[PDB]
Write a protein that holds these residues in place. Structure first.
Motif: not given
Ligand code: MET
Ligand code: NA
Length: 237
Positions: A96-102, A173-183, A237
């Protein structure tokens, strides 16, 4: 009714969070998706959300999933990565949501990708209770003496400010959704390289659950009617 396990997140509560002063009441992106999804079903699905976690740290999502197999949960709803060792033991819905490590690092570091991070000696942050830790040790075989657990985005931003030379990390290293919020709140950092896993989020159910398939189709209807991007927009941003 169904006993549905829900992760008791201590950070990034926009996805899933217990309501304060309750134990069976939850809000967040993932809950709203799941609710919407059940509504499109032709039959009724009574649920009781059960918190999984001690409320101090984010729980192990893999152990949470295992509770389905021990018959403690009839399913799990939350921000749960559909990863290979988990799919072995249960049936996830379609993502239901696309994710992936970055890799997240300061702008202009020598770290340009996952690859350049592996070959260095410098410490790496990961989210406490994330499958990320398992991947880093088993598939990428990075030494456990380099991996640093981090519970909150404040923890993220500190370990990046501090850096390796001050008991911090060179990158996370973390899944994009969490990373996106953090940034969103920390524009000083950037995702170096591309996504290097395609593990998406799904709802976990016992092997051979008609629920898993029927909701996979439901999730598609929500995507086509633009309600997925609507619910996304409402929570994230
Ligand atoms: C505490 S963040 C963990 C969430 C991640 N998707 C996992 O399933 O392991
Ligand atoms: Na039925």
């Amino acid at each position: 009714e169904l006993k549905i396990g829900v992760p008791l997140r201590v950070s990034y509560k926009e996805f899933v969070s217990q309501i304060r002063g309750t134990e069976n009441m939850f809000k967040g992106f993932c809950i709203d998706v799941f609710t919407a999804a059940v509504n499109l079903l032709p039959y009724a699905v009574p649920v009781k959300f059960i918190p999984y976690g001690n409320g101090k740290e984010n729980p192990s999502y893999t152990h949470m999933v295992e509770m389905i197999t021990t018959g403690n949960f009839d399913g799990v709803v939350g921000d749960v990565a559909i990863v290979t060792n988990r799919t072995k033991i249960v049936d996830f819905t379609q993502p239901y949501a696309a994710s992936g490590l970055v890799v997240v690092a300061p702008g202009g570091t020598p770290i340009k990708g996952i690859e350049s991070l592996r070959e260095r000696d410098d410490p790496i942050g990961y989210q406490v209770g994330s499958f990320a830790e398992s991947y880093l040790r088993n598939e990428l075989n990075i030494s456990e003496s380099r991996l640093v657990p981090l519970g909150t985005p404040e923890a993220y931003a500190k370990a990046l400010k501090d850096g390796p030379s001050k008991g911090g990390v060179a990158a996370i290293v973390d899944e994009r959704p969490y990373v996106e919020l953090f940034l969103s709140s920390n524009c000083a950092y950037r995702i170096v390289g591309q996504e290097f896993t395609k593990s998406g989020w799904g709802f976990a159910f016992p092997r051979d659950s008609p629920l898993a398939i029927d909701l996979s189709t439901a999730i598609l209807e929500l995507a086509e009617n633009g309600d997925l991007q609507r619910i996304h927009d409402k929570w994230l941003c």
